[PDB]
Design a binder for this molecule. Sequence first.
Ligand SMILES: OC[C@H]1O[C@@](CO)(O[C@H]2O[C@H](CO)[C@@H](O)[C@H](O)[C@H]2O)[C@@H](O)[C@@H]1O
Ligand SMILES: [Mg+2]
Length: 580
Amino acid sequence: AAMAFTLADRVTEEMLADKAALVVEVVEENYHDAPIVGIAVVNEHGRFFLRPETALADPQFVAWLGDETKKKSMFDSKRAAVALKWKGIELCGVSFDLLLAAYLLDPAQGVDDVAAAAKMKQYEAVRPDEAVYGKGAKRAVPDEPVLAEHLVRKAAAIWELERPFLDELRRNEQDRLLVELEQPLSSILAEMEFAGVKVDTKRLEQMGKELAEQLGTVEQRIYELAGQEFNINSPKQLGVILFEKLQLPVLKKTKTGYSTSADVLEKLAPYHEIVENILHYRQLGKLQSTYIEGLLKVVRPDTKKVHTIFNQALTQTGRLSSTEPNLQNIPIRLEEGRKIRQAFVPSESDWLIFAADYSQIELRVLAHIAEDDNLMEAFRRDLDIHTKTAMDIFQVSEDEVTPNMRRQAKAVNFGIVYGISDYGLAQNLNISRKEAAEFIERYFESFPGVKRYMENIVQEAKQKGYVTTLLHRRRYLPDITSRNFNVRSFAERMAMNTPIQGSAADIIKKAMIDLNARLKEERLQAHLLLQVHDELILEAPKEEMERLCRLVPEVMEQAVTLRVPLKVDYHYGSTWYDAK
DNA sequence: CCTGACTCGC
DNA sequence: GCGAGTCAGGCT
Ligand SMILES: OC[C@H]1O[C@@](CO)(O[C@H]2O[C@H](CO)[C@@H](O)[C@H](O)[C@H]2O)[C@@H](O)[C@@H]1O
Ligand SMILES: [Mg+2]
């Protein structure tokens, strides 16, 4: 049943056709400066397998790779593009990426290999990568015979699946989403990951020492207040000290035992002086383990840069995710954690970090899609939306809005931005589910358009089986018909939240594409470094700041045209921390 | 070596 | 509402 192919010892002309399925295999999950273990090409002339050391040293092959007119169909082209960048080789002409195509057709499938994508079209003449390479300690590249056939089978599947995938995307009206948005974005993310972000390791190591000292003190104080020493990091051991030895009350209980979440401890603080210390301990320990030691582990010792990997085909909303390290969750709320950002600096002297973020893009998108007159007017006046929401919900003038009123109005808006449950609102505001319901009801009286939208989107999700975003990204919600209240309610909140969060994702992705085109036209050295959901982080010569101050916000604000303006705030400084 | 509990961002 | 990374504890 084996698949026929040529295991070539040298590159030939028929291997350089202007249309082909290409496989440039990188087995290591983290593909930065990683090995390319084999190459497979499938075209009109047949199927071929080439040894990397052979193909990558061949002028003809390298030129073919870099020729934008020679079209390649691939799976996860960013992986190959970056692996090639580290070797000084440019990959161009990728006209179809099966991973991105499968992701757009149904992000819930979790397609992470050619076999998974192929199964969507009843194509099974290819093995899952895990079956070929195993997983974990047993992971490894098999002998050439097995490797070669696997790569050729993947290339063959890609070659065969391009047409059906493109046809369904077209039917879904997502063909431009793939070709004009996700694929071009893939190349931009590849440049961003490759460039990396410079880290001041000495700065990180210094704060690391401080934390270590502060942890040691708090750690001791904790054993003193408890009368004994224990593993504070053990929610099991901590529970014993807290709810048994010290007799603190049990307010919430986890599926396995005593709940020691920050929300719980906060309520126990007044009962004993140990609680505040445990909280402070959790905090410092979080920064030390995750943002100091964890970050230092992934910095490249030679360039002192971190090279994250943006997973472009994971989230169900269209947002990107970041790993090794995750640069989308660097502290900022609390000052102590915020200082971690002083560790991220420009890659060159006399360069600066420039950060631009969308102001309330989710609520602006909601005003647009729901066409709520009150909400649209609020943004047209560029009002503080939380203060305004408080004025309406509580029926008071702007002067009458107290800090606590604004805080609660902010929580209601937050719940709308992320589509959290009524139960979630009650929990966040530490009030009763019933009182939370009253707030929500009050909100709908003030924003009837939003109310209308929420009801209409749920019905639409039930009728069509999915909801869509501004640029036609899609999310199937089969649980929307479930007779189980909880499961159904969850699907309903996703129906409400996806067009909002998803459309916000579409916009920033287009802004990134538009921005890169503008930077190139202007011949600026500035370049994108990171994207954190609603913000773009760049670095550039200090001499380009003034131009970026006008260029970046404009490009971001004009990415799309909504019924309300889009607003972008920006700052720049010597470190990421200073770009505030 | 995998799940639960925790916490960080938006 | 979720992404990711940490830890501890049980697998084994
Ligand atoms: O190259 C990223 C791309 O690969 C997938 C599998 O096709 O994920 C792999 O690589 C990620 C980054 O190293 C890991 O987080 C993940 O565990 C590994 O399977 C895709 O999900 C992703 O788009
Ligand atoms: Mg913002």
